[PDB]
Design a protein around this ligand. Structure first.
Ligand SMILES: Nc1ccn([C@@H]2O[C@H](COP(=O)(O)OP(=O)(O)OP(=O)(O)O)[C@@H](O)[C@H]2O)c(=O)n1
Ligand SMILES: Nc1ccn([C@@H]2O[C@H](COP(=O)(O)OP(=O)(O)OP(=O)(O)O)[C@@H](O)[C@H]2O)c(=O)n1
Lengths: 557, 278, 278
């Protein structure tokens, strides 16, 4: 096997993940089977305790674990299904060694941070790097290991020990390291010294960088590359630079044009790794040239309406799912961020100025999106945003709480029933629009189209396939008692579960595009294969939905 | 001619009533058995002349590859047992590049160990790639299909696609040849073609000098139409497709030689111990 | 130590009650099955550690030869079916020169296609003759037994016959090695020998640079005691005879690796998923 560490810097937030999965996207250009592990220095075992206000969205796996949010950036860049084990954390590995301590697997020795815990970390990395995350069941050929925090943190010290020892447990010419570092510009001059002091830190703990990659406000000057390479064990051609680019999807072409892989090919001796891989490599490059061409080659404006949209990382997957689809439509994406509570009739006396800004965004947008918010607060405004797109023929997608609110609105305006509300307003009883279903429903579950719905815009985007598979995170579903009334009035539930009891998709009959999903489709959007409910929202906002379904926008003929 | 056709039918019928020959047919996608239909019928017509029961082993060429051993080990052993069992090897003029790497190892298996062989179209291409890749060294050599290697291309483009009935003329010294004996010592033959590539003429002197003698060429003498490896029991290839002129009373000569040498009777078929009427 | 011997007996017995591994053992006169007795027992002791049923295919090495195909064709196909079927290949340290030409083709078969391999004594000699004869070109190269060729002798005389328990020391950089992992990362091993020839030291840099890394040598560093081919799933040879120290509760490590890699479980045997007591 081969391995690539990505680590480093004098600051957290320097750029690692885009240098990580982006390096891993280019390993796939070579045809390689590829995987990724994110080592987190924080002490949470999983994101299941972490509220979406800090550390952001609880990204959800095929295996239904609530992981680190960043893992998602690797399931888009590489096109892989990761597992709950691919997110190593400081709380996860202290728990695993402490479990073995009380089980007595150390044969009554004292157990130490070195060597026992640093062995555990190496034994975890080489365990997880066997798992076949890729489009065929063979073990990966390269693993990208991203070390979070900064080298020289008292929180990241166990992992730089474990990785140093791993440079020997794995050989040189099988392991390599990319160190990401800061070139601050002040008084209009690129200063090298934070890279010198952080490389001094790196060699102290015993790792040696095979590349340096700079966060800089500028293109690095020719002398800045020379004054970094005069102070580190790299040639001047391995001081990589992730400068400003037209969009984040260009970074793997930037790295490839900086000859980043033409070194890793030699430095990891990758001639030592079938025709299927060689072909899938060339196809991945062709598909990259296609999505890149679709950026160079008109705007679509979408209002995303939810709770606390100020906290923009809390909707990260939704943004990326709109970006992947917008490159298929060749159209520039312009998300308007609306706080749902600023739409309310009460906000007009409380905070009038922001209420007009919110309503201008809703009124301007070519599509509306209710994104599957957290908790009840935004609901009253999200109803009025769903009403705005039901009545006037604006394209719409509701995700999770958005299907809940598409159904509350269609109840509250088409059936009358003005008292109806989410099951969250428990003591109203008779007018609850939803029912509890704890089984929380999580992870990849199927959904089956209702066999008559040949008219459907959404089941056309899915290619007329009989079923779909999707991620879930819900404790409530629409009350089955009401669903005949909604189906008879035209809010047709075009997809349901295995039992047929659960409301998984709705489409409003005879509207240009009004969909909702109980699942979160943004947790399976990929850059070459955009998630179909979001592709339909962009394509109908562009007024091109028919031609996307007919195939005028696939990447290769 | 009516009574003679009945007599010749009674002969081919008698040759079915009146021992097995096992042949490995090695190519792309052999699961799609109609895709090789003419090749099967050309082996059947010849097998009734030899009085021997035909048993075609179908080998997917890609299952012979050293990569298939880790990918799909079970089918790789089935493929190699067939190659190892067979009394003759046949590379049938496949479509596209995919099978090539295994078809090389099947040609090597019959070059080294004295197994009877016929290469048809891509089979001559692979008989020449193998003899280059193992007798001349030259381990980088490949079909002209791997275009950007340039210097090591074993073939050259010749679009004129070359099609239809064209002549082929024996090289006037090759009196030793097993194949030009089966053609009755006639000065030329006429055959069907379907090729866009031919063996690069620049190399052909090196192959002739090392013993891969091109016993038949075209009207110009520039084009590689037949090869026979000097001093092997039966190792032929044809750039043409001889299965497109095999007939039930007159079997196509390159396929008759493959069956007759697989039966170990090639001499006596040439000497005439198996013609239908005295 | 009495109760522990019973527990270890219950373990090896349980490992028989609690899937097949097929191994081709390729050598001279394999009909004389007592002549390989220690080799069989070393494969049995290891197969009970892997919990897998042992199926030795007996191959006469001379029946693999390209000459055997015209001389005795039927047995030649039986020999090649065994080689093609097997999950591992074993060249067992034969007596005299006769089998060599077929044992080369069995070593080639496992070098190219990623089949697990062990060469013992003459098997290391033939692993090195094959890697010379196919990776370096050098098609004339042979054992020092073909004395009057001189310049192309793959081996040198070293009479000191070298016999009895002598040490062998791992080369200090070879942390990647599958075999030195099975030995528990210990600095040296002790083993039985019976050889008058060793690989010519003049060539060993060329073999090390091409990837046939000699992962173990003697006290002087002049003598070739182990090889491992870099980046192959399991391709080992030993100049010593490891079957003369295989024990039923402690199987000889070069043979444990051959069975475990034939079972596709080598990693987990090294990691410890198959020791007898926790
Ligand atoms: N392939 C990627 C990589 C990053 N991002 C986005 O960029 C921001 C985080 O970038 P990252 O590469 O993780 O850098 P930071 O976390 O800021 O810093 P670090 O280097 O510490 O990860 C987030 O919006 C993340 O979703 C993304 O959309 N796609
Ligand atoms: N000397 C320190 C300081 C902090 N940490 C831990 O490592 C993390 C690094 O986060 P960072 O971004 O460094 O937060 P700050 O320390 O405030 O750094 P910044 O000022 O850039 O946020 C901290 O959150 C804390 O978990 C550490 O290990 N060692």
């Amino acid at each position: 096997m081969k391995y690539v560490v990505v680590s480093g810097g004098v600051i957290s937030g320097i750029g690692k993940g885009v240098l990580a999965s982006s390096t891993g996207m280019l390993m796939k250009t070579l045809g390689l089977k590829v995987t990724s592990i994110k080592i987190d220095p924080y002490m949470n075992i999983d994101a299941g305790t972490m509220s979406p206000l800090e550390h952001g969205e609880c990204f959800v796996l095929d295996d239904g674990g609530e992981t680190d949010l960043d893992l998602g950036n690797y399931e888009r860049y590489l096109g892989v299904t990761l597992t709950k084990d691919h997110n190593i954390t400081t709380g996860k590995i202290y728990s695993h060694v402490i479990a073995k301590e009380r089980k007595g697997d150390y044969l009554g020795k004292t157990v130490q941070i070195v060597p026992h815990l640093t062995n555990a970390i190496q034994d975890w990395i080489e365990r997880v790097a066997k798992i076949p995350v890729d489009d065929t069941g063979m073990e990966p050929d390269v693993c990208i290991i991203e070390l979070g925090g900064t080298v020289g943190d008292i929180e990241s010290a166990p992992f730089v020990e474990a990785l140093r020892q791993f440079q020997f447990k794995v050989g040189k010419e099988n392991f390599a390291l990319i160190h990401v570092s800061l070139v601050p510009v002040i008084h209009g001059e690129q200063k090298t010294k934070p890279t010198q002091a952080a490389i001094k830190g790196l060699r102290s703990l015993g790792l040696v960088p095979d590349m340096i990659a700079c966060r800089c406000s500028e293109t690095l000057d020719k002398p800045t590359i020379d004054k970094i390479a005069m102070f580190c064990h790299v040639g001047p051609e391995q001081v990589v630079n992730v400068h400003d680019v037209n969009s984040t999807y260009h970074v793997p072409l930037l790295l490839l044009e900086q000859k980043m892989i033409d070194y890793l090919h030699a430095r990891l001796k990758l001639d030592e790794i079938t025709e299927e891989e060689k072909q899938r490599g060339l196809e991945l490059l062709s598909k990259w040239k296609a999505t890149t061409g679709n950026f160079d080659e008109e705007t679509v404006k979408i209002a995303l309406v939810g709770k606390y949209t100020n906290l923009k990382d809390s909707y990260l997957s939704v943004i990326k799912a709109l970006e992947h689809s917008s490159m298929k439509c060749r159209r520039k994406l312009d998300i308007k961020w609306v706080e749902a509570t600023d739409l309310e009739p009460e906000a007009q006396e409380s905070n009038k100025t922001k209420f007009h800004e919110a309503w201008n965004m809703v009124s301007t947008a070519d599509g509306i999106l209710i994104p599957g918010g957290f908790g009840v607060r935004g609901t009253e405004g999200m109803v009025l945003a769903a009403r705005w797109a039901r009545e006037n023929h604006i394209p719409f997608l509701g995700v999770c709480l958005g299907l809940q609110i598409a159904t509350i609105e269609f109840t509250r305006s088409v059936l009358g029933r003005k008292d109806s509300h989410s099951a969250e307003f428990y003591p109203d009883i008779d007018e609850k629009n939803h029912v509890v279903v704890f089984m929380m429903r999580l992870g990849l579950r199927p959904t089956f189209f209702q066999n008559e719905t040949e008219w459907s815009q959404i089941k056309k985007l899915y290619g007329d396939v009989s079923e779909v598979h999707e991620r879930h995170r819900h404790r409530y579903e629409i009350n089955p008692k009401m669903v005949d009334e909604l189906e008879n009035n035209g809010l047709i539930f075009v997809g349901k579960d295995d039992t047929g009891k659960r409301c998984e998709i709705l489409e409003l009959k005879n509207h240009p595009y009004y969909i909702a999903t109980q699942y979160h489709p943004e947790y399976t959007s990929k850059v070459l294969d955009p998630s179909k409910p979001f592709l339909g929202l962009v394509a109908a906002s562009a007024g091109i939905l028919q031609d996307v379904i007919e195939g005028k926008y696939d990447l290769e003929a």
